[PDB]
Symmetry: C3
Subunit: 341 residues, 3 copies
């Protein structure tokens, strides 16, 4: 009558995550600075569910997972639903790897975010950017996504296509596709990825976007580790207009006993529209962090960082293009905790 792991058809998994996070804004509205600014909590804890199933008439193993969103972020109300995060189904054989339908990370985004949005670099390197149309999607519903196996312990591919933000609501024909690749090499790992976005409606124009990324990551027998990337973003409006913007992000780490120190930098460079540059569309961030390996399963950290954002641009409709900078330059000290089970 007792239970085993085999009694259940699902696993609960969770990621408990809290960050007390103080911000000092410097947008040059003294008022706006206090709203945005100050301390908040940022609970990005969440729960999920997943399981396998060996169907009796299909050798590829069935897989499914349903992850809840963040329960009470900062700048946010409480509560969140099941499947705001990685929710999907799929299959897996050892020979061809796996494929997932639904709501996953794009293969481009998985690198933009990790390792290269950590820590605090997201504002600039993730959704920061001044480019038109859509540089890439991130987590996206309506996606199919192949993850190849590790070919001869070195080479891996992340391939995916899916529907757009609008089209998954039947309010557009926006689509996209993307591919990434990863080459393990001694202590290195080479990352390259791509993602084209088509029929994007924005500023009263249709946009095709293309984004390319190269980067590298190292882990060394002595405790030094690092990551670095260059991202390039093109885009083209249906009225002829071209835009270009490139960025980067870099991270240096020292690890020692139960500790890890981390400096990160990232930046988008001035933006080009039709050969002419747009002065002060630069963004950058510097960041620093101490982290403590408080349990095999958890970490504490303390963190400071500084965003200096762009001084703004119009989109193609003669009206301000929203950027991770429209709220304004801010800095931010935070302590936090994270627990995996």
């Amino acid at each position: 009558e007792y239970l085993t792991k085999d009694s259940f058809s699902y696993e609960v998994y969770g990621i408990i995550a809290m960050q007390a996070a103080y911000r000092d804004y410097d947008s040059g509205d003294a008022k706006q600075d206090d709203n945005l600014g100050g301390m908040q909590l940022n609970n990005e804890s969440r729960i999920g569910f997943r399981g396998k199933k060996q169907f009796a008439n299909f050798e590829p193993t069935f897989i499914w997972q349903i992850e809840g969103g963040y329960v009470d972020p900062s700048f946010g109300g409480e509560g969140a639903g099941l499947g705001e995060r990685d929710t999907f189904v799929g299959f897996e054989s050892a020979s061809w790897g796996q494929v997932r339908l639904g709501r996953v990370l794009t293969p481009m985004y998985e690198l933009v975010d990790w390792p290269a949005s950590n820590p605090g670099l997201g504002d600039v390197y993730d959704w920061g950017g001044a480019i038109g149309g859509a540089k890439y999607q991130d987590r996206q519903s309506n996606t199919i996504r192949w993850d190849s196996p590790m070919y001869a312990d070195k080479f891996s591919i992340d391939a995916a296509v899916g529907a757009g933000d609008k089209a998954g609501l039947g309010a557009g024909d926006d689509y996209w596709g993307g591919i990434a690749a990863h080459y393990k090499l001694g202590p290195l790992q080479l990352d390259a990825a791509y993602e084209g976005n088509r029929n994007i409606e924005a500023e009263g124009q249709t946009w095709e976007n293309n984004t390319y990324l190269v980067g590298v990551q190292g882990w060394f027998e002595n405790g030094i580790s690092f990551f670095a990337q260059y991202k390039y973003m093109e885009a083209d409006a249906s009225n002829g207009v071209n835009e270009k913007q490139d960025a980067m992000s870099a991270g240096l780490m020292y690890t020692t006993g139960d500790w890890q120190y981390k400096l990160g930098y990232a930046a988008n460079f001035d933006l080009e529209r039709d050969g002419k540059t747009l002065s002060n569309t630069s963004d950058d961030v510097v960041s620093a962090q101490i982290m403590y390996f408080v349990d095999p399963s958890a970490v504490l950290y303390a963190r400071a960082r500084m965003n200096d954002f762009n001084e703004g641009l119009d989109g193609l409709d003669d009206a301000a293009r929203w950027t991770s900078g429209t709220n304004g330059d801010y800095n931010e000290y935070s302590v936090g905790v994270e627990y995996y089970f």
Copy 2:
């Protein structure tokens, strides 16, 4: 202190369900056709919770359940909450069956939807219809519902009443009740059901609605199976106006080893307002489907279907009445998967 089934006071249950689904619209706006049209995923996976409890001072066994909504449907955003689907409490004795309070299916709806909205027929036979007021509720909050036992292996009753869509928000005095019945007979099963809806506010008129259904269902020793129904809908405005509309839905099936083939048809007939018919308020759908019994616990399927919808009508306020047809005629090929645990 190992665990058993008896260690827990709840059960997690899930229904994992994914459907890649391509649509070709033919509304005669070329633009509108692309938005709506195209492929989308349709994750209707969800999770729930439920348990019994034998209260020491009450012989009837306590029952409760909380089912999450669909996590990332088509034409929809991601995420969903606990108790968007069948959420309730109740009790049960073998002599009188069970009763449930909260959010359940109406006894009418349980038949409209099953078997007779499957497969793809829902657009027409479920929420499709041109009639005024409210034909029936479906899943409804604020409901009490009795499910009688199987009297002498043949006769069963589904009985229920509850509050309206408005009244459960304290913005109305809408109410309703409904009853169904089921008679098992050799290889057949006779279904009849009813549902009256009162004080419904709509088109600046209060409406009383009455809807009646008869149908049948057969399973044969040789692998043929089928279902058929006629649904009749009356409604009456508080300004005198009458409306009538009838429908039907039929399903033929062949099953064989691990396979099941399925043709379905359904249709609402032109609508009558005060004796005069409204030409082209007809809707129909034809649908076909192969399904494969991929595990005791799961099925794969492939499916095609064609909706031809009504060409539109006004409500009693001289302004378009919304119908499952306002977006327009479309067809749709889909593959999907479904897993129960």
Copy 3:
């Protein structure tokens, strides 16, 4: 190979709760009376998750929990998310007690609500009130909160500070802090609590608020129990204006075998603005209830009550201040059930 309690890193806990609840409104719009009025179900069931963790490098035990909102209340739509209720992380040592970051009850609110909003008294004693600004927060995101241990079996402190309703969305600089205290004494328990609220934006003024509470609670060897409180609320606008309002709430109980009878009363008194009283800003409620201890884990109850609310006031902008009375005087009979696991 089997599982134990120690196999999991989380616990599922739930509170299943249903209340059929009929209301007869008497606002003197005959229409309004029916909308609001009538029966509804009130499912306040919900689910949560929580767990401890003994980090290898930190003696204080890690604690976390994530509680879902109410699944289908009355006057409400269905569904709710994970972490609409008490969601947090924290730590605990026996010497200093515990601390929690996130979304918790304020230390003031925990007493306002319990024991002194039960049963039905909430309308008047919880969010009822006519005072300006914000008397107190209740459940609040972005809060840190210390719960001291029980010092020498008598003395306990609940201390907390957090951000405002706006500021947790970066749309304000509202903050607050609060402290309660509890002295066990023979069969009594003395409660006192406090909560100041700062920079509250409302009626085109900034408000500082201060709210003070004293109360008492008794349990007697013979089956009688009771509670009582007096709550005092000051507030001060940034345009000079002062307001004052005091309230109370009292509860008498007899318990016997498996039964408990309960009379409750509560009331807010007329409100003072700048020394002058606002006639008929009084609110009160009387309530009665029988409850049956149907299982170690659950209760049934039946309940009647009567709210007589204020006849209305303006805020400082010459426009109606919302109160738990704007909808109007109502009474209400209800039966319900509650199950803990």
